[PDB]
Write a protein that binds this ligand. Structure first.
Ligand SMILES: [Mg+2]
Ligand SMILES: [Zn+2]
Length: 347
């Protein structure tokens, strides 16, 4: 009957204020949010605010973009969905008419409306929200709304592996065993790769990498990453190197890890500049940045529903919605022990 939202009142400080229940436009669904994931971008938003200040002096800055729930109402022209459907949402709604949308790259649309961002700052941390039916997806019966929430980061890794043309016979190195690195690992497995090395510095993440199917795990703090990778690839380098931690160490490392003619994929981020040794990759190596996802939700939902892609095992912490402040503090303070945290929104 009533709504509320968690707002970034000032960087580092969340609270929950009242909000009106949105009315779905004729092509939208109205969803009762049940789970909201916490990823790097939300934690950075909590710490710094959005990097474009709101045009409005006292704009209510929402947070959260990975979410799922149950349809409560639908707009008058919605046929795909009905009240009671459990769904997730793809949080980036592109313009649909620019050169990039029309060319199959809507993810890089210059007018994408992405949750908890620039023009509108609509956060998924709320009891009720509206979303276009075209970017909402029904969950299989064997997939709960917490799994539906984690389709979004899984889609990030799926898009990277698909962009990279992962295939059997391609040796893969994944730099980073955080959430996105583990998603990329499982995506590489779904695309048939059989030799996957995963590099991180935390033994708990490498334990999870091995559980999720890494062929070899390498602790860059206790081992020589370049030497161990050269052994892994028989001194030839890997066909594909994924950089997923967004750190300077890893990006600068990837040139030394890839084979001639191979690919380096930068899965998101990299906030600072990084010095690249192009001499080491002068034989037609490709470096490509990877940005969110395009047309990946169905195949990712498929992969999770089948059991081949395990997102439930990645959830290490579940926070109640009214405890959202601690959820974001711990996501900063105890980053060491969190693979993936989610926020449960019950009444
Ligand atoms: Mg995400
Ligand atoms: Zn567009």
């Amino acid at each position: 009957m009533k709504n509320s939202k968690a707002i970034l009142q000032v960087p580092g400080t969340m609270k929950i204020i009242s909000a009106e229940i949105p009315v779905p436009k004729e092509d939208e669904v109205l969803i009762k949010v049940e789970y909201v994931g916490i990823c790097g971008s939300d934690v950075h938003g909590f710490e710094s605010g959005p990097f474009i200040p709101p045009k409005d002096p006292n704009q209510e800055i929402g947070l959260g973009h990975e979410c799922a729930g149950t349809v409560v109402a639908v707009g008058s022209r919605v046929r795909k969905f009905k009240p009671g459907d459990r769904v997730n949402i793809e949080p980036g709604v592109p313009c649909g008419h620019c050169r990039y949308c029309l060319e199959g790259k809507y993810n890089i649309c210059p007018d994408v409306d992405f949750m908890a961002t620039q023009p509108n700052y609509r956060g998924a941390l709320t009891h009720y929200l509206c979303h276009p039916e075209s970017f909402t997806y029904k969950l299989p019966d064997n997939m709960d709304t917490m799994e539906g929430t984690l389709v979004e980061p899984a889609a990030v890794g799926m898009h990277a592996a698909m962009l990279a043309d992962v295939k059997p016979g391609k040796k893969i190195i994944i730099l980073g065993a955080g959430c996105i690195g583990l998603m990329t690992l499982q995506a590489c497995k779904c695309l048939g790769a059989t030799e996957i090395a995963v590099v991180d510095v935390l033994e708990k993440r490498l334990a999870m990498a091995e559980q999720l199917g890494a062929t070899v795990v390498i602790n860059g703090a206790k081992e020589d990453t370049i030497a161990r990778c050269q052994q892994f690839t028989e001194d030839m380098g890997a066909d594909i190197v994924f950089e997923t931690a967004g750190s300077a160490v890893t990006v600068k490392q990837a040139p030394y890890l890839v084979m001639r003619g191979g690919k380096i994929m930068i899965v998101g981020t990299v906030p600072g500049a990084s010095a690249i040794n192009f001499l080491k990759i002068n034989r037609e190596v490709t470096i490509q940045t990877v940005f969110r996802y395009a047309n990946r939700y169905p195949v990712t939902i498929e992969a999770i529903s089948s059991g081949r892609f395990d997102v439930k095992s990645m959830v290490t912490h579940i926070y109640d919605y009214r405890d959202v402040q601690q959820a974001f503090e711990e996501s900063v303070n105890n980053k060491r022990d969190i693979i993936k945290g989610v926020i449960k929104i019950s009444d």
